[PDB]
Design a protein around this ligand. Structure first.
Ligand SMILES: [Zn+2]
Lengths: 193, 63, 70, 50, 86, 122
RNA sequence: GCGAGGCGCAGGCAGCCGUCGAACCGGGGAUUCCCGAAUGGGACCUCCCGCGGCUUAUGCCGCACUCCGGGGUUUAUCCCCGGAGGGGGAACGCGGGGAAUUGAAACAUCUUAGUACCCGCAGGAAAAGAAAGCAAAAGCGAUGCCGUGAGUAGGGGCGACCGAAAACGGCAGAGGGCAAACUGAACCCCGGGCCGACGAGGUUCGGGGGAUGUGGGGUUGUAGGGCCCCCGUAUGAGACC
RNA sequence: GGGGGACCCUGAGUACCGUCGGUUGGAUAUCCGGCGGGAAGCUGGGAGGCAUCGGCUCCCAACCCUAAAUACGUCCCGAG
């Protein structure tokens, strides 16, 4: 099918027409808002693998975030030399996670399912996020996604239950080296990461 | 083993049928029946478990 | 008054009774601060509760009529 | 003070109605047990909360 | 406000009685949410009289008091006698 | 202005002829509607003519069809509207690409379209 | 339901309610002012000021913002239909940000400490959960919790101090679904009708989605699955509504 | 419901490498994040506490859900 061709094209954008397409696309995107809904996913194979379907209740949102780490605000009280660091710091959440949370803030009645990287220049990074409406009967009637309509699945992106959240929590490792990862970071004294 | 559905409620208060064996939730009774059969029929001799580890576990449990 | 005798009459009679009892309650409330030799100090309470009964039963009758019509 | 909003006037009215002594029949009924309430007020010594 | 829910009670003080005798004025403690038009309509409908003027004030106890002056064709003494004020 | 996957300029009469061929093939011969089915037919070498819409967004949907058809030696033609392509294909939604397996009563028309495409830019 | 008294804390005056069964008690209803997420628009005062429909009038309904699924037009994101989020909760939970007094007999790595506190997000629990694992004579077989491993391996101005997992014995035990290969509208939702029983189930019409793929199928390692070929079977057995 | 095949499928800015900051008992051998690079993809891939080569053993990531055994007490029963 065409999914393998899309995957092959997006394997390395600079080695295909995707390089020029993305060069024009970022020029177009830099003038768009930080969070904006789009009609169809750019990477159809990635969307389908992560769970997107062509039915009512699924929306796609492109989010742009700034590259780099974070700078801590200046400390007002006294600090010891080990606590004065300001510049060389990075967020413990990935930029994909931050973009997902921004999309969740923009859309209050929807739930984050997954997201994928779609491009980046030297200043910005772009992610496309799949949102699901849990109150739509079409969504409720599909057993693949109907689980998201339950009460205890509220704010999953904020609580760290998406793929990016699990990657940040370190739930992708088992056995040696993952002692302080399960059952939760807080349950392991918050020292597993 | 009994595979009777368990009623659970939605955010809006709608009813869902939950499989007691795996936890999957459905809105259609036909879908629930089809899932129960196709997924757990091997417990009644209609099929075999999926996975080498599960097959070994079931063989050890049986004998 | 009693709920049975209240239910025995219709909506218009209930409304007229409610208006009469409201006026009578106002008159007794005036007489309470006017005079001192009050033979029955429970007139105000009895009138208030009869008004409550009349309103409740009238609303019940309206609900029953709507249910029957639908 | 000359110009007063209605809500503040109503709150002052409630405080004024609160400020009064315990009824003699209440004292008789309680058998000298209930003699006062904690809402008594003197306008020049104990001031209002608002 | 619907009439028969406006008037709470009459006022039977010495000032009230003197006003009744002299200026053809009744005086009622009425609902605080009622306006002058509501008071006028309530008095007219209840007592089958014509109201000339309505003045209102809010007492220091939070109640609303209304002075209702009747037209010269109607006597407030008769209404007071009907209401028991005398 | 045209998307990068468009390799040549198709005249309006040629596009209309392609749409008419698609309609006749749907009526009497055999067609495949949908990008997945068209790609599978091209890979299996069963397609006699491929029709691609010029208003596909994103371009990744049909960006492989021109190189694949050139590699497999199968003629293809561009049409303006995917909505009208789907309407000709008979479905109630737009079709990004269509393949003609059995021309049926449009054999000569398909041959003429293929010859014109080969002469113009192949 | 109880069965003769009752009208709160609360021992008074006068009255009234109860045998047509009260008070009281279990269940179901009615009323439920204003502010408050406060939501049509405003608040130096929990009070004020509006616009569209119906209504004779009384009076009732609708009108916040950020979105989702739709319709219309003036295409203004303007109007209408249906549906979401907001705020609260003693402790427990999940995800981020993160000190110093103090100890080291001073103090900077360290400790205090991923602590106090801050920010965000859920529930009656939450999170985790079915091996690209643990182990090497042998093997085990999802997750979570308890005992122990153990102040051990190990970190540390190797200073003060910090510090596990596997295995073993227990409580409880349960496993499933996608993406793709293949097929190709055989599909889902909303509303109406008809059969069936009013339900399950079956069928039909209009609208919204859907060929940028709805539905069917498939979920795994000395491999599993799709497709093709060959032999057999269903007459039966079972599960669920 | 079982056998065979020579055809097809099995998740990418991902695994992983270098460097920087945080975190960890994780020590040249923990986990998380930023920056610069970045595959194979079934004739395939990963792990086995410094790095590489050979053997052997175990396994199939980069998608999702899952009751019971547990934690608490604004509340209730019971007890000291
Ligand atoms: Zn099940």
């Amino acid at each position: 099918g065409m999914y393998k061709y899309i995957r092959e094209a997006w394997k390395s954008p600079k080695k295909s027409y995707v390089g020029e397409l993305l060069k024009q696309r970022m020029i177009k995107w830099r003038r768009e808002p930080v969070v904006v809904r789009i009609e169809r996913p750019t990477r159809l194979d990635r969307a389908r693998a992560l769970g997107y379907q062509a039915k009512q209740g699924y929306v796609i949102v492109r989010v742009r975030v700034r590259k780099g780490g974070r700078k801590r605000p200046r400390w007002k009280g006294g600090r010891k030399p080990s606590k004065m660091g300001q510049v060389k710091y990075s967020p413990k959440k990935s930029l994909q996670w931050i973009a997902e949370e921004k999309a969740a803030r923009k859309f209050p009645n929807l739930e984050v399912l997954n997201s994928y990287w779609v491009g980046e220049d030297g200043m910005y990074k772009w992610f496309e996020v799949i949102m699901v409406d849990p109150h739509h009967p079409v969504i409720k009637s599909d057993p693949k996604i109907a689980w998201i309509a339950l009460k205890h699945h509220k704010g999953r992106v904020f609580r760290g239950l998406t793929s990016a959240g699990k990657k940040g929590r370190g739930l992708r490792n088992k056995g040696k080296g993952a002692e302080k990862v399960r059952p939760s970071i807080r349950a392991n004294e918050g020292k597993g990461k | 083993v009994k595979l009777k559905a368990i009623i659970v409620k939605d955010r809006d208060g709608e009813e869902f049928l939950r499989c007691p064996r795996c936890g999957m939730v459905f809105k259609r009774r036909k879908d629930y029946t089809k899932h129960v059969n196709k997924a757990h029929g091997w417990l009644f001799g209609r099929g075999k478990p999926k996975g080498k580890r599960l097959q070994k576990k079931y063989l050890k449990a049986s004998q | 008054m009693k709920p049975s005798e209240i239910r025995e009459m219709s909506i218009e009679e209930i409304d007229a009774k409610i208006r009469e009892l409201r006026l009578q309650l106002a008159k007794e409330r005036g007489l309470l601060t006017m005079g001192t030799s009050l033979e029955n100090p429970m007139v105000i309470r009895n009138l208030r509760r009869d008004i409550a009964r009349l309103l409740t039963i009238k609303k019940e009758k309206l609900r029953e009529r709507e249910k029957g019509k639908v | 003070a000359r110009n007063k909003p209605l809500a503040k006037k109503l709150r002052l009215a409630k405080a004024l109605k609160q400020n009064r002594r315990v009824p003699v029949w209440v004292i008789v009924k309680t058998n000298r047990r209930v003699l006062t309430h904690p809402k008594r007020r003197y306008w020049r010594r104990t001031k209002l909360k608002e | 406000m619907d009439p028969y829910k406006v008037i709470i009670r009459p006022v039977v003080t010495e000032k009230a009685i003197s006003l009744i005798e002299k200026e053809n004025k009744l005086t009622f403690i009425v609902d605080r949410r009622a306006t002058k038009q509501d008071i006028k309509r309530a008095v007219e409908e209840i007592f089958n009289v014509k109201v000339e003027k309505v003045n209102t004030l809010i007492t220091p106890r939070g109640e609303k008091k209304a002075y209702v002056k009747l037209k010269p064709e109607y006597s407030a003494s008769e209404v007071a006698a009907r209401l028991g004020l005398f | 202005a045209k998307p990068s996957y468009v390799k040549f300029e198709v005249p309006k009469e040629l596009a209309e002829k392609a749409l008419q061929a698609v309609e006749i093939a749907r009526d009497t011969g055999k067609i495949r509607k949908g990008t997945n089915e068209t790609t599978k037919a091209v890979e299996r070498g069963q397609a006699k003519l491929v029709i691609i819409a010029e208003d596909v967004d994103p371009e990744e949907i049909v960006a492989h069809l021109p190189p694949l058809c050139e590699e497999k030696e199968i003629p293809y033609i561009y049409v303006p509207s995917k909505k009208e392509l789907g309407a000709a294909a008979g479905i109630e939604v737009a079709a990004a690409s269509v393949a003609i397996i059995e021309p049926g009563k449009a054999r000569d028309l398909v041959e003429e379209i293929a010859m014109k495409v080969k002469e113009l830019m192949k």
